[PDB]
Amino acid sequence: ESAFDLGFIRGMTFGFVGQHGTWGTDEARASMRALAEQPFNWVTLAFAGLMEHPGDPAIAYGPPVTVSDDEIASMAELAHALGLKVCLKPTVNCRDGTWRGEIRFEKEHGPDLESWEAWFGSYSDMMAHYAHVAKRTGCEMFCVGCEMTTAEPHEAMWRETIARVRTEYDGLVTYNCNHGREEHVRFWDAVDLISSSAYYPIDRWRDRVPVLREVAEAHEKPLFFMEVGCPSRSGSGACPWDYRHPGAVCLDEQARFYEAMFAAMPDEPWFKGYMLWEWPWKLYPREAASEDGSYCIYGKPAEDVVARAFSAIANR
């Protein structure tokens, strides 16, 4: 169905970074079952192809690097049988640890150089491949990119990648920008839904909503969060995007983040919901949650905070 008619998204991201073999495990199947017991109507299957360095245009994806096409199909099939809609979200990470939002090339053109042209060649090839996987596996959404801040001004190359995806895939298409980039992306017209990694600090939510509304209304597209969440660590609510943030385990900090977000987001048709970050393919037991400092909400007060809000939206 169309974008404005879409049911409000109550989602969870699963299985990142999608290392080869991990989703084909009994653990992954048990973890997906646990995810589906929460009041989620969506799951995002997220995984990363690999670049050697942020200036290398070559991208390694598929086995032995990523989960296989069969592993993706297995997870999509399981999620679908459990009543979830599925977004497929391929992305790229750098082996040297450089954030994908900082990839950069010295040249725009040159197919045998380290150019934006060469990289988008590799990236378009990868996205076409997974767009075809998404079609074959009946995925209801496909995400053409995540947090690609340095790549964004290459509008023509993004439009090509999107047109290539459209060729392979006729479901809903989004691009996932970083927090603070919602108003900066210039190709929102080429996708069906505007999405962002909305890691806004606890105290920034109320202030940020107006611009988010303005972005949705300006481009006449619904907007949702392709990533939102907070680690259960002390002070993390001030820097939700940072998985490396040092601090004692703190379950309340994560809960406060979710409460602040839910409090600030209006019940207005331009806003289409939440794809939470994140759920592991190997899920810890409930009792171990008090020791866990990750983004996962399982077994923590945030689980209940999320369940209450999502159930209320669901049972309406």
TrEMBL record:
CDD domains: GH113-like
Name assigned to this protein: Endo-beta-1,4-mannanase
Source taxonomy: Bacteria, Bacillati, Bacillota, Bacilli, Bacillales
